From a paper:
In this study, six X-ray structures of DNA and HNA polymerases are reported: (i) three apo- structures of TgoT, TgoT_6G12, and TgoT_RT521-; (ii) two DNA-bound structures of TgoT_6G12 in binary and ternary complexes; and (iii) one DNA-bound structure of TgoT_6G12, which has incorporated two HNA nucleotides. Consistent with all other DNAPs from B-family, TgoT and its variants fold into five distinct structural subdomains.
In addition, another TgoT mutant capable of synthesizing complementary DNA from an HNA template was discovered. This mutant, named TgoT_RT521, is a reverse transcriptase that was engineered de novo. Compared to TgoT, this mutant has only two additional mutations, I521L and E664K. To better understand how the mutations added on TgoT variants impact the structure of the polymerase, the X-ray structures of the apo form of TgoT, replicative polymerase TgoT_6G12, and reverse transcriptase TgoT_RT521 were solved by crystallography. Comparison of TgoT_6G12 with TgoT_RT521 structures shows a strong similarity between the two polymerases (r.m.s. deviation for Cα atoms: 0.6 Å). The final apo TgoT_6G12 and TgoT_RT521 structures contained flexible segments in the thumb subdomains.
Residue numbers in the entry: 1 to 383, 385 to 610, 613 to 659, 727 to 755
Write the structure that this text describes.
Amino acid sequence: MILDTDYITEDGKPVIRIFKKENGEFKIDYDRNFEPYIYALLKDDSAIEDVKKITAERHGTTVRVVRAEKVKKKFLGRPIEVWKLYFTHPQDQPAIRDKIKEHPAVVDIYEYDIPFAKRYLIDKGLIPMEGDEELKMLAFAIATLYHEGEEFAEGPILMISYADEEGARVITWKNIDLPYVDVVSTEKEMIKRFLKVVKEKDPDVLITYNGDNFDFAYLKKRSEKLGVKFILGREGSEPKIQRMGDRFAVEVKGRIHFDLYPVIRRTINLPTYTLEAVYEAIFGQPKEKVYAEEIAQAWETGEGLERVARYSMEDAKVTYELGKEFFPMEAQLSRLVGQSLWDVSRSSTGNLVEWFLLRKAYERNELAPNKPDERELARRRESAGGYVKEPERGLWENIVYLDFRSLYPSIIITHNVSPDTLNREGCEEYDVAPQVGHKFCKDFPGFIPSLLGDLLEERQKVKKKMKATIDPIEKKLLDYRQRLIKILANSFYGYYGYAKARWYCKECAESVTAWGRQYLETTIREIEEKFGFKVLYADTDGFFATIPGADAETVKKKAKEFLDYINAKLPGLLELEYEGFYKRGFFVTKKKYAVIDEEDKITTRGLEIRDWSEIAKETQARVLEAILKHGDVEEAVRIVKEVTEKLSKYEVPPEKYDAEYYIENQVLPAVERILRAFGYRKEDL
């Protein structure tokens, strides 16, 4: 399988390198015949001879147009003839693109800023991370001597830890009596020992937590200070430090540097992103933090070195565990988007769709539009929000939740919403978005709706293959692919309003939201007027409904009957589904509610919880239980009165003191936010 691609220069000519792992062995394939190129749109084809002679200069080298070729492509749903201009080196493109654009006979230039190594994967139809190859992984972490008024990496590295299938170990230059600690004489010897470990283990993946902005930079500065050959690449190179935006990223040639930090930063939403908080959120297990002051104090003639070595060991161990949890998902994401795991794991959702579209555009001979210039970028201010019903406050019995299956992708497909179909003149059929009035041609399938349709079809083909796959490892992998297709399909709407997007269409985005608001509001009035349901609450693509004075099985039956009715009325791919049944449910405000199923599991959208005392969290759970399991509001009130009395009589442990503070600032605020809708103010208790 393909792990990554890059290029090196030999005699001024680019040489693509394809890093592979085939049949358990590392390989490097070279391609010396891939030519960089750009497209140029001309006002007259006779002008090609003048544009071929356009020159620029990169160093002492004169940059010329090597070869031109007339090509016929599709651009915004219309055929177009452009000239494919070839160059010697990919770095010639930024040097000459402006001179070619400024030529009077040139209307515009295209596909001039697609990185050479990524251009290669797309054009060759190559997909990284494809196959069943087993990748060897190794996580690592470092512990450093920190003092407040010092420069970066002024203090030495105290410990280097690593972890894999064999376990976790710590390399240090102080005598620590632990079985997993390897003692060396100096910091230099510790770094050298780490390099030998990586070289001998030869992992395909190096896993870190913030290694892009800390670990590698620290190791680099210390290796320069100590005169150590910091070679980690499989081809004898040092880690390459790159600038993506305001921060950094690190590549290790021949391997995949998998930094968990950017991945977890976009997967889960947490108040803090410390390694301890992220491990505790994913695995539900606590992890002790040992601060820089404690580590410095312990190192400077300290007995607590075993505690710091254990912290170092746990850093590598949890990094390996987290890497095992997120790597298979990123591998499937890489295979779906068609780019290396290194790029994919560091990319935003908007850029992931862009790479997917760039590949599909090449396969379909679709000329890609350019990224917005600085002027157009400033003009792309977001004007976006679905329908939110104000909830009917109070306690409700036997509530069903109905929602649309992929509402926004269904709208895009059904109404052919795309920049290439927007206000296109000359069609015999159009769909008009309500409120915003944008028209979309229906005669020809649009570029994006066509791909979105194939994504949904591919998702179903993957789901069927998953049910038939006996192999549990492959079943989990197919589960990732099917979930990733859903995520990618549900990213097209956001991509339409993504300011940096090539296929940007604010009109498309507004139209999807407007149609979405229409379908949800139409369905609500339909279930109220034709089935006598009460819609308690609704948000964007679904609603909670019930029949005041009806049995649980009666509500279920009429809900299924409504589904048969409205699904026959809904156009194209739009489909309403039965998501789940709830015995009880109370709706406080927009985005604040709580429901309970027949199993007695409570789902909450406004829970108050580690910067909150256990007494407040326990009372809240007791209140919710009384409301959702017993349906007794009078009991929920009594519980709070009981807890406040136990706190005031000093009968409650302080953590699990100022009795007035824990009543007025802890218990009451956490419980009032739930009992609020009933009219139970703080003065009501």
